[PDB]
Structures are given as C-alpha cells and as structure tokens.
Design an enzyme around this catalytic site. Structure first.
Site, PDB file in Angstrom:
ATOM      1  N   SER B 162       0.982  -1.151  -0.150  1.00 44.19           N
ATOM      2  CA  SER B 162       0.034  -0.094  -0.018  1.00 44.19           C
ATOM      3  C   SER B 162       0.996   1.140   0.023  1.00 44.19           C
ATOM      4  O   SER B 162       1.612   1.411  -0.702  1.00 44.19           O
ATOM      5  CB  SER B 162      -0.899  -0.335   1.136  1.00 44.19           C
ATOM      6  N   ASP B 259      -9.677  -3.394  -5.680  1.00 43.47           N
ATOM      7  CA  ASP B 259      -8.994  -2.556  -5.186  1.00 43.47           C
ATOM      8  C   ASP B 259      -9.085  -0.979  -5.965  1.00 43.47           C
ATOM      9  O   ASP B 259      -8.687  -1.307  -7.282  1.00 43.47           O
ATOM     10  CB  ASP B 259      -7.689  -2.868  -5.000  1.00 43.47           C
ATOM     11  N   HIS B 289      -7.774  -4.603  -1.547  1.00 41.83           N
ATOM     12  CA  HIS B 289      -6.557  -3.979  -1.219  1.00 41.83           C
ATOM     13  C   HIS B 289      -6.333  -4.538   0.611  1.00 41.83           C
ATOM     14  O   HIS B 289      -6.980  -4.695   1.379  1.00 41.83           O
ATOM     15  CB  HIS B 289      -6.957  -2.325  -0.804  1.00 41.83           C
TER      16      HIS B 289
END
Lengths: 316, 316
Positions: B162, B259, B289
C-alpha cells in the site's frame, strides 16, 4: 517522457492520414486569435469532408433562451423512423456544422434517419451548461414543431464525437433528470468521448502534439468551457457523478486505441454494463482520437460510422 | 452509487476474512485521536500476525537527519545474499513494525534474505518527503556499517504494501536520481501500491466502507502526508512524473482485483514494460486492498508473499 511511442504504434491506415499534406493551407496559427484558429480548422477540415453524400438539406434558426441557434437537417428519405441529433467535437472551442458535414451525411445515409446538426455556441464565449441548454431547447422546439418541419420526433437520438459525445450523453441525462419529454431517446452514439475522468491509465500513457490531448491541452479546454471551478463536479460535466445505474438510453461506445480518453469510454461501458444498462462497446484498433473524420481514406472510420448508425436503427 | 457491488464479487476466501469477528476488541475509535486509532490498529492487527515464522530478530536505533529511527532485523539464515528493506503500509498515518511482523517474517523466510523493517515517522507529524529521507538514511547507515551488523549490503531491495509500496519505489528512485550508492538495488516488491494517479477507472468503480478507500478517505490520507497541494506533482509522490524510462530496478507489481488503487499498479507496469524496464505484474483474483496481512487464512495472501520473494531472489 513516459508516454508510449504512439506515432510508431498506430495502424498503417491511420499513419497515411497523419502523413497527409495539404499544401494549399497556411501554417497552424498556434499564436493567433481563437477566431483565426477556428478559421484554420474549418479550412483544414474541408479536404476530409469532400465526397459527402448528396441529399436534401435544410437550414433553420431555432429559438433558445440564449438567442437563436443554427441547425442543419439532412433528410435521406421521406419516411424517417426517427431523428438523430448530431453534436460535433472540437474541444468546445472549435468546429461547426461544416467541419462535420461528411460524418453527419454518412450517418443519415447509413441509418436512413434524418440527422439534425446543432450549431451550439462555442467556448469561451459560451460556458457550461449553455451548449447543453441550447441543445435541449432545439430538441424541444423540433419536437413541438415536428409537423411543420416534416420530421419524425416520436423517437430521437443524440450522437457525437469527442467533446460532442460528452454533449450527447449529457443532453440525454439532462432530459431524464429534468423530466423533459421531447421524444423517446432511442439511443446515444458516442465516438471517443470524455465523461469526466480527471486522470487515468490512458491519459498518462497517451496524448501529444499529434492529437492535442496532453494533460496541459486538456486543462486548457476545461478552462475555456467551465465558468466556475465547482462545475468540475457537476453531473452534466463529470457524468460519472450522475446516476448511471438506471434509465440510461442504449449507448454505443466507440473507443480509439491510442487515445488518452479511451479509459473514459471503458469506464462508461463498464459502469453501464455492471448495472444492466443497455450498451455496446467497440475498440477500433490502430486509431487516434478524432478518426471519425477520415472515412474516405480509412476503412476503420467508415466502419465506426456504419456501426453507430446500425446500433441506432437496431433500437427502432 | 455507480460503484460495483464489491462485497458480492470478492472471493469466498476473502469473504471469510471480511466476516471474521474479534469479539474481545472494542469498536474502532473513529472520533478518537490519531494516537488512539494507532493503538487500536496495533491491537486489532495482533490476531492476523499470530503464528509468524520463528526467527532471530534484533531491534536497532539508527541515525537520520530527523533523529534516530527504530529498525528491526529478521535473520532467516547465517549467509544472507542480500538485504530487503520493508516499508509498512497504513495510509501514512497508521501501522508500525508490529502490525507487519508476520509479513516481514514470511518475506525473510521465503526469500532467505535478511529483512530490515524501518519504523519511518508517521504523518501528520512527519510530512513528505521525511519518511523517504529517513529510509534512505537508514539504508546508507546499514551499508556503511554492514560488517558490524553482519548483513550483506552488496545487494539490496525495497519492499512494501500500500503506502509502503509508494515508499519502496520512491526510495529506489531517490537513490537513482541523486546518485547515492548504498548498495545495488536488485529489486523492488510492490504490493497493491499507489503511485500518484488522481483518478482512474478503478478509483471510480471501487472503494467503500469495506476497505476505507473512498475518494474522501483517499483525499484525507493525502492531506495528512503532503504539506502542499503542489507536492501532489512531485516525482517522489506522483512517481509517474519521475522518469520511468531508464534505470528502474526490477519491479514486482501485485494488484488486488477489487481495489480502487489497482490501476495505479496497471499503469506502473504498462509504463515500465513499454520502456523495456524489468518488471512483472500479477493480479491476485478475488482480493481487497491490504490482503497481504491475511496469509494464515488466505492461500492467496501467502502466495503473494512467496511470489515477491521468488522474484527478488531471481534477481540475485
């Protein structure tokens, strides 16, 4: 910098167009007035519009709250099953009924529908939502006066290229959202439009001097069209901020492979399809943005015209 | 609204995680302080970090121009061929070495390389580019002190999830751009990162309360990290504004299917591939995600770790 080498990746057909010289033209006045740039565009477009189908044509001025707007009717036959409104491209700042003459005439030939081009007021003189209001006004005028003009306004459609595709779908949504009935909207034909993405994979990978679609160019066109920054989020500009999950008329969505706006087309299609709204997408391989103008030289351009025309008549 | 019904499209294995309850936990303190939210995330993450690989670990404080920062070395074997620096995710505002303990231990285990997690300073207390400068400083410190720490700093890599993935590639590009040699960057491991797109097909279709990745959530993390709107364009934030056409270390790019940030990964991959830069993309079907944390329960999360480890060791 990080862009794709687009001029090498386009098709041999597209390249013949890109490499075509018009030796009788002045150079592109990148530092002239808007008025001069419009004139050059009109002059340069003439060669691509040659050979247009010959048919009955009528020009009328129609009333709007912003004043009168010119329209041009192309009538292929005496028993049209519907009327198709055509909104031209040109970034909201260029273009007119002459730059798109051949596209509108071929659409009429291939659909056997009356095609009505609207000469909406260009930006920056007009700002959002003026053009869309003019289009709705024109549509509604023709619907009220259908018998006098000898047109069938029982079923209509909206069609357009590039910025005109944005106007086409925004008009259809405006009619839906404001409960305005100026004929049943049988279909919308949307060639390489943009619908409000601010960035995307394709915008990052594509765009350059060959199409006038760099990030900077796109900001320039947005600055000319909008009056307020808040309008960036209007659901008649960022159409993805409108409700696309219901009651959208059947949309034919044509994407150009090497166009930075292609993702706008893919998002509209993916959105519509995920919510069971009627649509079709078709990618035209090897193309740049604005290819619809090149039907005389490019089989792919004529195919895109045929395909939209046929999508429309399949709804009737 | 126009979004996809994500909770219905995710895989059965992802749904088992989404539906897992920790009854002994308080409810998420949404109106509490950042300090409180950080402590909660720490606590909630413990259950997902349990059962991590056994291995020798050591904590060390390292100097940076902003003060000392904590690091943790995970040493899977006595003869590591390279050192991987692990930058954790959590939107720049959450997470620490504990919340990503299992990810790092699995990565060290499957790679058989030393993994060094860096406790970079979080935002809003730090702002961009402080974390990146901290990471570079830590890396150069370990490089200078390699013999003392009994680590192999002749080949290095950066790895993250991320926001951490953004830090990973930003750090590699910083070293390149400033001509800093703190070890040969053999590869970069990027799980479901974001690299500066402001909008995309996936940003429009996905994101919700299920992943905390709506447009407003995304804006809020950016506001916390950046001091200035202009920093949105920096080549260490919007990495697509950096040069991606040369000397980019081998990148492993892992996308999560549902995502909103997926197109950031797709763009990075297509860009690198188009310029002959070494990379591999893999999509992990059915995922949200942040799925790397769920490796005990989700084969796919564990596979993603193995895949990134294997890519890195293949560069050595």
């Amino acid at each position: 910098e990080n862009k794709l080498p687009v001029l090498d990746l386009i098709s041999a057909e597209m390249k013949t167009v890109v490499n075509t010289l018009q030796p009788d033209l002045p150079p592109w006045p990148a530092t002239g007035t808007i008025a001069e740039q419009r004139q050059y565009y009109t002059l340069e477009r003439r060669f691509w519009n040659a050979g247009a189908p010959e048919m009955a044509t009528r020009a009328y001025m129609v009333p709007t709250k912003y004043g009168q707007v010119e329209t041009r009717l192309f009538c292929p036959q005496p028993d049209s099953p519907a009327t198709l409104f055509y909104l031209h491209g040109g970034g909201f700042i260029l273009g007119n009924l002459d730059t798109h003459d051949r596209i509108m005439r071929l659409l009429a030939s291939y659909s056997q529908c009356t095609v009505i081009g609207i000469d909406y007021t260009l930006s920056p003189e007009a700002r959002f939502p003026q053009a869309i209001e003019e289009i709705v006004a024109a549509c509604c005028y023709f619907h009220q006066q259908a018998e006098d003009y000898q047109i069938n306004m029982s079923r209509i459609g909206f069609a357009g290229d590039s910025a005109g595709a944005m106007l086409a779908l925004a008009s259809a949504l405006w009619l839906r959202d404001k409960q305005i009935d100026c004929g049943k909207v049988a279909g919308v034909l949307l060639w390489y439009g943009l619908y409000g993405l601010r960035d995307s994979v394709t915008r990052r990978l594509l765009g350059g001097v060959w199409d006038g679609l760099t990030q900077q160019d796109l900001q320039m066109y947005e600055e000319a069209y909008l009056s307020n920054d808040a309008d960036r989020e209007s659901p008649y500009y960022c159409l993805f901020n409108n409700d696309l999950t219901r009651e959208v008329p059947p949309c034919f969505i044509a994407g150009a492979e090497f166009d930075p706006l292609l993702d706008d087309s893919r998002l509209l299609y993916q959105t519509l399809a995920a919510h069971q709204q009627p649509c079709e997408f078709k990618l035209y391989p090897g193309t740049l943005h604005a290819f619809l103008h090149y039907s005389r030289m490019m089989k792919t351009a004529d195919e895109a015209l045929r395909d939209g025309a046929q999508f429309f008549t399949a709804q009737l």
